[PDB]
Amino acid sequence: TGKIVQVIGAVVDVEFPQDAVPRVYDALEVQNGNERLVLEVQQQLGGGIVRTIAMGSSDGLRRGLDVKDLEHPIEVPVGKATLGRIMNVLGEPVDMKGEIGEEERWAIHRAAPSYEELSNSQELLETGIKVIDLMAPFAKGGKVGLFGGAGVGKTVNMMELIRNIAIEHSGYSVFAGVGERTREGNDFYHEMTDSNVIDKVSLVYGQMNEPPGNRLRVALTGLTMAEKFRDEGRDVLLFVDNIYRYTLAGTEVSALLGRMPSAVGYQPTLAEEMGVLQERITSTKTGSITSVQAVYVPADDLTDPSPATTFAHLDATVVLSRQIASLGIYPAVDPLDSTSRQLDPLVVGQEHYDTARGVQSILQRYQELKDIIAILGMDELSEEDKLVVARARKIQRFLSQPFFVAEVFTGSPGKYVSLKDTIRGFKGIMEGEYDHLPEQAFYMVGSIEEAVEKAKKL
Amino acid sequence: MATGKIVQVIGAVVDVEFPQDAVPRVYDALEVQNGNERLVLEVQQQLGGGIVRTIAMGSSDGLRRGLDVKDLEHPIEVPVGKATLGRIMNVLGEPVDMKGEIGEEERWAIHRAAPSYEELSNSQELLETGIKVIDLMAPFAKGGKVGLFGGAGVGKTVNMMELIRNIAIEHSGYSVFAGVGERTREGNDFYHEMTDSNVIDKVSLVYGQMNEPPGNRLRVALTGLTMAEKFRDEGRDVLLFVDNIYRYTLAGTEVSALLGRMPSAVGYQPTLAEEMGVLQERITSTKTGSITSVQAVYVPADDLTDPSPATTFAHLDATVVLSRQIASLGIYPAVDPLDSTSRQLDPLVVGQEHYDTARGVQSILQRYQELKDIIAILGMDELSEEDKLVVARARKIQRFLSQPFFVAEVFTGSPGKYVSLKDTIRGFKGIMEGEYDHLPEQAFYMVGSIEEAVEKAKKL
Amino acid sequence: EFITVARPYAKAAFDFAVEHQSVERWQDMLAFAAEVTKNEQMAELLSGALAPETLAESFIAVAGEQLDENGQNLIRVMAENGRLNALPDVLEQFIHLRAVSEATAEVDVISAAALSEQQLAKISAAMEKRLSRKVKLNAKIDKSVMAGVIIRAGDMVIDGSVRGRLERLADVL
Amino acid sequence: MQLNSTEISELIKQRIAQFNVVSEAHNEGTIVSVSDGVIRIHGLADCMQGEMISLPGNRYAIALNLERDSVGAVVMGPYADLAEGMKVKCTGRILEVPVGRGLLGRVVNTLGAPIDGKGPLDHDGFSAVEAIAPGVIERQSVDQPVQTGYKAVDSMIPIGRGQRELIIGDRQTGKTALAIDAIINQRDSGIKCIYVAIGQKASTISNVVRKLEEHGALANTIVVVATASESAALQYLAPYAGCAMGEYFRDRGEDALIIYDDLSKQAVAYRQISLLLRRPPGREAFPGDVFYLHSRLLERAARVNAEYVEAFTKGEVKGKTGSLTALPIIETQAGDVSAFVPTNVISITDGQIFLETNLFNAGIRPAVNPGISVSRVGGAAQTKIMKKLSGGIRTALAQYRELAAFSQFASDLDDATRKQLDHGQKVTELLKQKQYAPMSVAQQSLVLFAAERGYLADVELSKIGSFEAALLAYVDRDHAPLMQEINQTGGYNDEIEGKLKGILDSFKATQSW
Amino acid sequence: QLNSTEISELIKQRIAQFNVVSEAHNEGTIVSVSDGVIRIHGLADCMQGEMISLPGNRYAIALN
Amino acid sequence: AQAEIEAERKRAREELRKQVAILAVAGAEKIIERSVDEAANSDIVDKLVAEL
Amino acid sequence: AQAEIEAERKRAREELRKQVAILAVAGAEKIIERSVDEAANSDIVDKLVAEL
Ligand SMILES: Nc1ncnc2c1ncn2[C@@H]1O[C@H](COP(=O)(O)OP(=O)(O)OP(=O)(O)O)[C@@H](O)[C@H]1O
Ligand SMILES: Nc1ncnc2c1ncn2[C@@H]1O[C@H](COP(=O)(O)OP(=O)(O)O)[C@@H](O)[C@H]1O
Ligand SMILES: Nc1ncnc2c1ncn2[C@@H]1O[C@H](COP(=O)(O)OP(=O)(O)O)[C@@H](O)[C@H]1O
Ligand SMILES: [Mg+2]
Ligand SMILES: [Mg+2]
Incomplete structure (x- = not known):
């Protein structure tokens, strides 16, 4: 009952009778050759025209085709039936099994929970990772974000967190792959299915090959599946593989939607697009969502508008850096930029808090000397400041750890380090009780015991 | 018969409207009577409705609206061939010197396609310039591009004149000098420095200088190149000098801004790499002949990352940088052996003996460069005896890179020398293999071959 | 070029002319308006920046072949939007919408030489089947084409000419 | 002989036979603009985005935009000779x-x-x-x-x-x-x-x-x-x-x-x-x-x-x-x-x-x-053999290369760091390789064997090259079967480790390089 | 050359009578909706900063 | 060397086929313009209208 | 071998001069199904035979 009138890249304009124009976010349908193409309207231009985004390949569309108005928004399968299966942005099953026997379908556009319904939790969550749970401990039901450039470890860290908390966790889990490699999605699907945990994970995948609209709405499609388990009374884990692609897909489409560019070419509505998503991924009195989000920062510029506007939406922020990863120090967390809302004397105890702050102080004091060391050499440093440097370097190395998911790279077996066991090692290194041991005794060891043991072999 | 009419005039951009079926094709030339003299317009774009947008190859002041425009059915065409040697011409191939008409018989369009894939030479030769420093440390490929990054007061013009002389005499090739966007004073004194050394009859000059509208500075390089191509088709080996490729980039930036196109990397036109490529991809060695090119390059803001140098260096094969220092010591030519580079220096192309001789002298000089600082601070006799020998050989090599030009006789008085490559390799292997340690460093200075250094030491 | 800005006005004028069964009067009124735009003096006036409601009135003055309300009103609206120069195209799209509504087409026939007027009859009869429209023919003669015929129906062409066959064979090889 | 004129003639004949003379209906448009390689086509009511549009000559243009009243396209070739008014044909491809x-x-x-x-x-x-x-x-x-x-x-x-x-x-x-x-x-x-x-x-x-x-x-x-x-x-x-x-x-x-x-x-x-x-x-x-x-x-x-x-x-x-x-x-x-x-x-x-x-x-x-x-x-x-011999070799060279940054001036622990440095240095001297000289997995494997199981401390930085040349010539001369085996399989076993050790000591002692 | 909310049926109304009824100075009609901005046709007596009341219980601020 | 011998064989074969191909169609054109008349025009027009 | 290929090329060209006149007629008759006589074309076919 409508005609196409323009096809610019990924956006399509459709003309309808004045009295039947669809509403915003309703879904239309066309026939692109043999296939059926779903459009989602973004704007109601004047005169019955409506401007839409194609959820599929836009090639092959002529003008004047006839499009049908489906009178409901995009709706996805939801609930228990969607568990252990892979789905499109449109909720269609993408593994070669049959239909999803869903009893209910939910619109992917929803309002965030009211302020009255929110809930706050001080219950610490423990992970096997030294640096994360010393510098930036995070709590059940809270948001976590791994900030880093390209190729620094923010996917390997997310797979390690999945390993350490997701298998030892009762409730279900949801994994949304937003604009990342299909290879990694296949690898993760098969690793899960081979350990029989797949029947606890729901997967959504709008990987990098797909046109902008799929990457644009796949994140919402995942949040809906998560919100369902939350409202059912359960507690959920939500892993988003790269939330930067959700805004990159908005930037790709913005100019075609006829909107004046902004700070660095970004859409004028960047902060609202980002908030309208991250405000509904929260825990509430009727259930809790625990979420880990990888956040790519373009060109390693931590001040680009997209990371800068994301920082405000996370409780614990872990900032990876290339200058550390280039030292072979994995994980490459930058201890002088990672933080957590949960690092307070009240929440984590005076001993943990004090050790974390001492480590920060030492590493910063070492940063301040790095230029005088560069120009004048290390022999000009006062004897007090040469001890600071050696302890700083020992601490730099002791934050490294082997991961079970990185055996494929280094061959060394992974390690799981309890919190009680790491604050002790750092208290020791700082207080000086290990101040007679070569630095390389600390590279890639689990606990301080293993370091004093490795020193025997040099 | 004229058919168009000027409809807009804005700076150097003029719009003319033709009948709907007679719209000129892009790059076609048009002409108008700008008062008492004709003016040539080059088409840049076709807007809808029979309107076409052009750039004036001349000062556009005095242009009314509605003037009749005659549509030449061909691009700008220039005279080519032997007839243009020793003349001076502007972008439109008009004799700009006052010695009258050019007596050519054939005229070529300046817009052309690069040689197809299967016209290119299925070999890789070298060009024997005849200068020791270049032939050793920065050999030229026949049909390649050579950047010349020297500054001022170092002899760029006399190096160019020596290359012109040698490539006319010791080969049978001519030369073309395109004066893209540089001072008029240097053009006039270059014309004279060449007329009084008898090389003017061996070079064809085309000048579009800083005092010209943007279109002239843009297309002058194509004029020079399309004369060099005519010389190539005769089977010759030709040499093409560009006075500054950076100004050929900047004229295109000005024009692109005039046309209103969106800016790109750091202020440049969006078509920077294609404008540079369609030029640099026409000077290649064809199965019939070859055009070699020596191009002066200016790096903005001392940045080798700026889009213009970064785009140019994609095409340069060799690179010779002139140094004020090496001149101050008195060594002429003033090439810097440590900064001059060439991607022809590989055993697989130049051979193992030439490659390792060049690498030898390079290592010798780059050690001497710091033994001399150790001397400057601690005094001479602090050195080791091995190092004193290194210094004593480095000084000799450094002296032997001088040469007397046929063009420099008017300064040195000594007769100019043309040194074949074999002789330079022999001389430097000898000086580096410990031969000739028995004669003084001033026996090598400004000599020529080593077989003349021995004779100069004989009489010293 | 006003191909796009003329569409709303042509559509509105045609929908109005239908409600009142005056399509022929509207078409002639528009054909007169589009000629008032081409006069040498009026084209000067339309360019200089006059206030829309005085430009519209001086335009209405030069036309007494426009019916009192509805032509004058169309001119006033286009003048308010500053689009009086679009009339020559409003006319073309009005003629097009009319041809579509009355189910008519006008197909060109290009030949090496005039046809037999039985050939023309068969061509019209065949096209009136290819297209639901009653089709006019306006045969034209070109001699670059040398045998066969070209049938052009809007933006649809049937390259029956032998010249087409030659150019289409040369590029097979 | 093989410039068979009858072959050329039969080729062309088959083409003229495998022809289609029946006319076909296609859709047409007109170029409205030309600039910097972009084209603006008016008409083509039936074009589809991504299509190939055919221009005068045999060149093509790709349709990028289907605007309301025009098609935007880029020319895939020299565009200078196109001119407003030219017709274009919409191929259904x-x-x-x-x-x-x-x-x-x-x-x-x-x-x-x-x-x-x-x-x-x-x-x-x-x-x-x-x-x-x-x-x-x-x-x-x-x-x-x-x-x-x-x-x-x-x-x-x-x-x-x-x-x-x-x-x-x-x-x-x-x-x-x-x-x-x-x-x-x-x-x-x-x-x-x-x-x-x-x-x-x-x-x-x-x-x-x-x-x-x-x-x-x-x-x-x-x-x-x-x-x-x-x-x-x-x-x-x-x-x-x-x-x-x-x-x-x-x-x-x-x-x-x-x-x-x-x-x-x-x-x-x-x-x-x-x-x-x-x-x-x-x-x-x-x-x-x-x-x-x-x-x-x-x-x-x-x-x-x-x-x-x-x-x-x-x-x-x-x-x-x-x-x-x-x-x-x-x-x-x-x-x-x-x-x-x-x-x-x-x-x-x-x-x-x-x-x-x-x-x-x-x-x-x-x-x-x-x-x-x-x-x-x-x-x-x-391959299994390469995965074994290689191990953390790359992070080992990274450590060596960074250590060289500080050891540039001075170092302590200076026997273990000394052997570390010598090993890493000889390894980098061994990893460099000439252009156009590929070497099978067998040669890389036994050279990495020599690199990892000692066998190279004595030979100088000046001889690494010679060690490799000799080693490979010797193994090509004598143990052609073992190479034929390691090249056919991943080929790792204590048996093959022993064979390699034997070849290593044999070449090392009796051959003089 | 681009349109300014000159659309078919509004133009047709103006053809019907140029001097359209002025009673509706207090109300208008939404013609566009996007990204939280709406364009309203009419409202001849809207004042800058005024509050405009939409269907339901919602308001908008007239800025342009 | 054998490789280039074979490639030049291929290239000369193609070079010759090209000339044969262009001259075939130029001859066909001249023959057609030399041989068409009212009968052939009428035949072509009738045969295309019969399938129009 | 190149100087052998040149002789091969002339050898085959002189033969293909006979085939141009066949292919031109075959094409002309394929494009217009009205058969054509060699007689009236015997002259213009000769220019093709000559120029290859
Ligand atoms: N393993 C090697 N040993 C010795 N020389 C080498 C080696 N690899 C490359 N070269 C030399 O380096 C030169 C340039 O290398 P190459 O052209 O492959 O780099 P490139 O990045 O492709 O250059 P460009 O970026 O200009 O294309 C070559 O001429 C080659 O002689
Ligand atoms: N614990 C670790 N041990 C070894 N390598 C690691 C470790 N963590 C990350 N890496 C390295 O990080 C590199 C980047 O991988 P990845 O994390 O997928 O990049 P990205 O940040 O784009 O996801 C890997 O190739 C891997 O070698
Ligand atoms: N081969 C040479 N022999 C002697 N003198 C030279 C030689 N090359 C350059 N010079 C001197 O160097 C000076 C630089 O002059 P010039 O070439 O005009 O400057 P630039 O090259 O910067 O235009 C000249 O005055 C000339 O005397
Ligand atoms: Mg990743
Ligand atoms: Mg390369």
């Missing part, structure tokens, strides 16, 4: 490229037109240039190895069939060399190869073709070329043509390898095409979708499971798995590994080989910089 195994050994334009003089193509139909890569369920984990000729990358940075491995570095550091040395090495391993050159000089391409012919590899490679002089619409569309030619092998259960000569110049040509359409630019003036440009390209280099190969080929091929391996090359200014486009492609591929200029100027070639180059498929793609 989305952008398509000849594909087949008959293209092997040809040099081809981005539109599939052969630019070498050797006449028309033999090809198995046409493939769409723009396609969506296989889904997540259709992939399979990369298992098999792809052997280059170089100890450095085959040991530290393995490449598996189906991987995508960025070769990144500065200008004149050996990228093209490292890539065509991987192309030459597949001469006998059954992996068809494709080499696409975007924005390169014509002289360089002619030279590279002459080398591919000099080593016999050309009969196994397709060359897709868009030189620096060609339109920005051929440069931008070339790598998609090359990937469409490689997917032909991928989808039939075979193996292929494709090299994009500069995906930095593809980005520049796309930036040109985008700015000429007045599209708001982003960082470094690149468009918004400069990531999607490389994403939808490199995501096609995939490995597919046997069910995808069956379903695609209508069941003609059972049990096999196809793969397309990609080696994109990127150029970075001043070694700046943190610009925009370099970082995008590092974020799209499965690893990077980072060629550093300080090493290249120091005579270390291939100048692989350990510590910045990784292979995210890790050892799964190595």
Whole structure:
């Protein structure tokens, strides 16, 4: 009952009778050759025209085709039936099994929970990772974000967190792959299915090959599946593989939607697009969502508008850096930029808090000397400041750890380090009780015991 | 018969409207009577409705609206061939010197396609310039591009004149000098420095200088190149000098801004790499002949990352940088052996003996460069005896890179020398293999071959 | 070029002319308006920046072949939007919408030489089947084409000419 | 003899016989504008986005925009001779490229037109240039190895069939060399190869073709070329043509390898095409979708499971798995590994080989910089023997290279750091290798054996070269069977370890090098 | 050359009578909706900063 | 050397086929313009209208 | 071998001069199904035979 009138890249304009124009976010349908193409309207231009985004390949569309108005928004399968299966942005099953026997379908556009319904939790969550749970401990039901450039470890860290908390966790889990490699999605699907945990994970995948609209709405499609388990009374884990692609897909489409560019070419509505998503991924009195989000920062510029506007939406922020990863120090967390809302004397105890702050102080004091060391050499440093440097370097190395998911790279077996066991090692290194041991005794060891043991072999 | 009419005039951009079926094709030339003299317009774009947008190859002041425009059915065409040697011409191939008409018989369009894939030479030769420093440390490929990054007061013009002389005499090739966007004073004194050394009859000059509208500075390089191509088709080996490729980039930036196109990397036109490529991809060695090119390059803001140098260096094969220092010591030519580079220096192309001789002298000089600082601070006799020998050989090599030009006789008085490559390799292997340690460093200075250094030491 | 800005006005004028069964009067009124735009003096006036409601009135003055309300009103609206120069195209799209509504087409026939007027009859009869429209023919003669015929129906062409066959064979090889 | 005039005449005769004379109805439009290679066509009520529009001459144009009243298109060739008013014909074809195994050994334009003089193509139909890569369920984990000729990358940075491995570095550091040395090495391993050159000089391409012919590899490679002089619409569309030619092998259960000569110049040509359409630019003036440009390209280099190969080929091929391996090359200014486009492609591929200029100027070639180059498929793609001997060798060299930074002045612990330094130094002196000298997995393996089981402390930095030359000649002379065995299998066992130790002591003692 | 909310049926109304009824100075009609901005046709007596009341219980601020 | 011998064989074969191909169509054109008349025009027009 | 290929080329060209006149007629008759006589074309076919 409508005609196409323009096809610019990924956006399509459709003309309808004045009295039947669809509403915003309703879904239309066309026939692109043999296939059926779903459009989602973004704007109601004047005169019955409506401007839409194609959820599929836009090639092959002529003008004047006839499009049908489906009178409901995009709706996805939801609930228990969607568990252990892979789905499109449109909720269609993408593994070669049959239909999803869903009893209910939910619109992917929803309002965030009211302020009255929110809930706050001080219950610490423990992970096997030294640096994360010393510098930036995070709590059940809270948001976590791994900030880093390209190729620094923010996917390997997310797979390690999945390993350490997701298998030892009762409730279900949801994994949304937003604009990342299909290879990694296949690898993760098969690793899960081979350990029989797949029947606890729901997967959504709008990987990098797909046109902008799929990457644009796949994140919402995942949040809906998560919100369902939350409202059912359960507690959920939500892993988003790269939330930067959700805004990159908005930037790709913005100019075609006829909107004046902004700070660095970004859409004028960047902060609202980002908030309208991250405000509904929260825990509430009727259930809790625990979420880990990888956040790519373009060109390693931590001040680009997209990371800068994301920082405000996370409780614990872990900032990876290339200058550390280039030292072979994995994980490459930058201890002088990672933080957590949960690092307070009240929440984590005076001993943990004090050790974390001492480590920060030492590493910063070492940063301040790095230029005088560069120009004048290390022999000009006062004897007090040469001890600071050696302890700083020992601490730099002791934050490294082997991961079970990185055996494929280094061959060394992974390690799981309890919190009680790491604050002790750092208290020791700082207080000086290990101040007679070569630095390389600390590279890639689990606990301080293993370091004093490795020193025997040099 | 004229058919168009000027409809807009804005700076150097003029719009003319033709009948709907007679719209000129892009790059076609048009002409108008700008008062008492004709003016040539080059088409840049076709807007809808029979309107076409052009750039004036001349000062556009005095242009009314509605003037009749005659549509030449061909691009700008220039005279080519032997007839243009020793003349001076502007972008439109008009004799700009006052010695009258050019007596050519054939005229070529300046817009052309690069040689197809299967016209290119299925070999890789070298060009024997005849200068020791270049032939050793920065050999030229026949049909390649050579950047010349020297500054001022170092002899760029006399190096160019020596290359012109040698490539006319010791080969049978001519030369073309395109004066893209540089001072008029240097053009006039270059014309004279060449007329009084008898090389003017061996070079064809085309000048579009800083005092010209943007279109002239843009297309002058194509004029020079399309004369060099005519010389190539005769089977010759030709040499093409560009006075500054950076100004050929900047004229295109000005024009692109005039046309209103969106800016790109750091202020440049969006078509920077294609404008540079369609030029640099026409000077290649064809199965019939070859055009070699020596191009002066200016790096903005001392940045080798700026889009213009970064785009140019994609095409340069060799690179010779002139140094004020090496001149101050008195060594002429003033090439810097440590900064001059060439991607022809590989055993697989130049051979193992030439490659390792060049690498030898390079290592010798780059050690001497710091033994001399150790001397400057601690005094001479602090050195080791091995190092004193290194210094004593480095000084000799450094002296032997001088040469007397046929063009420099008017300064040195000594007769100019043309040194074949074999002789330079022999001389430097000898000086580096410990031969000739028995004669003084001033026996090598400004000599020529080593077989003349021995004779100069004989009489010293 | 006003191909796009003329569409709303042509559509509105045609929908109005239908409600009142005056399509022929509207078409002639528009054909007169589009000629008032081409006069040498009026084209000067339309360019200089006059206030829309005085430009519209001086335009209405030069036309007494426009019916009192509805032509004058169309001119006033286009003048308010500053689009009086679009009339020559409003006319073309009005003629097009009319041809579509009355189910008519006008197909060109290009030949090496005039046809037999039985050939023309068969061509019209065949096209009136290819297209639901009653089709006019306006045969034209070109001699670059040398045998066969070209049938052009809007933006649809049937390259029956032998010249087409030659150019289409040369590029097979 | 073989210039059979009767053969030419029969060819043309078959063509004239295999003709179609019946007329056909097509849709027409008119060019309204021409500027900087972009065209504006009025009409074509029935054009579809992505279509091929046919222009006067035999050139083509691609439809990018279907505006309300006009079609925007870019000319795939020289546009200067087009003029307003010319008619254009809408072919019912989305952008398509000849594909087949008959293209092997040809040099081809981005539109599939052969630019070498050797006449028309033999090809198995046409493939769409723009396609969506296989889904997540259709992939399979990369298992098999792809052997280059170089100890450095085959040991530290393995490449598996189906991987995508960025070769990144500065200008004149050996990228093209490292890539065509991987192309030459597949001469006998059954992996068809494709080499696409975007924005390169014509002289360089002619030279590279002459080398591919000099080593016999050309009969196994397709060359897709868009030189620096060609339109920005051929440069931008070339790598998609090359990937469409490689997917032909991928989808039939075979193996292929494709090299994009500069995906930095593809980005520049796309930036040109985008700015000429007045599209708001982003960082470094690149468009918004400069990531999607490389994403939808490199995501096609995939490995597919046997069910995808069956379903695609209508069941003609059972049990096999196809793969397309990609080696994109990127150029970075001043070694700046943190610009925009370099970082995008590092974020799209499965690893990077980072060629550093300080090493290249120091005579270390291939100048692989350990510590910045990784292979995210890790050892799964190595042969068993290589995976064993190599181990953490790369992080070992990274440690050695950083230690050299501080030990430059002075060091303590100065016997263990001393032996560490000597070992690492001899290893770097052993990893450098000459151009065009590939060495089988057997030779790399036994040389790494000699490297790791001591056996090299005594021989000097001056002799490493000689040690290797002798070692390999000796083993070629005597233990030809053991080489024939290690080359046929992953070949690791305590039996083979003992055989290697025996050869090592034999050569070490009785041979004098 | 681009349109300014000159659309078919509004133009047709103006053809019907140029001097349209002025009673509705207090109300108007939404013609566009996007990203949280709406264009309203009419409202001849709207004042800058005024509050405009939409269907339901919602308001908008007239800025342009 | 053998490789280039074979490639030049291929290239000369193609070079010759090209000339044969272009001259075939130029001859066909001249023959047609030399041989068409009312009968052939009427035949072509009738045969295309019969399938129009 | 190249100087052998040149002789091969002349040898085959002189033969293909006979085939141009066949292919031109075959094409002309394929494009217009009205058969054509050699007689009236015997002259213009000769220019093709000559110029190859
Ligand atoms: N392993 C090696 N040993 C010695 N020389 C080498 C080696 N690899 C490359 N080279 C030399 O480096 C030179 C340039 O290398 P190459 O052209 O492959 O780099 P590139 O990055 O492709 O250059 P460009 O970026 O200009 O294309 C070559 O001429 C070659 O001689
Ligand atoms: N714990 C670790 N041990 C070894 N390598 C690691 C570790 N963590 C990360 N890496 C390295 O990080 C590199 C980048 O991988 P990845 O995390 O997928 O990049 P991205 O940040 O884009 O996801 C890998 O190739 C791997 O070698
Ligand atoms: N081969 C040479 N022999 C003697 N003198 C030279 C030689 N080359 C350059 N010079 C001197 O160097 C000076 C630089 O002059 P000039 O070439 O005009 O400057 P520039 O090259 O910067 O234009 C000249 O005055 C000339 O005397
Ligand atoms: Mg990742
Ligand atoms: Mg290269």
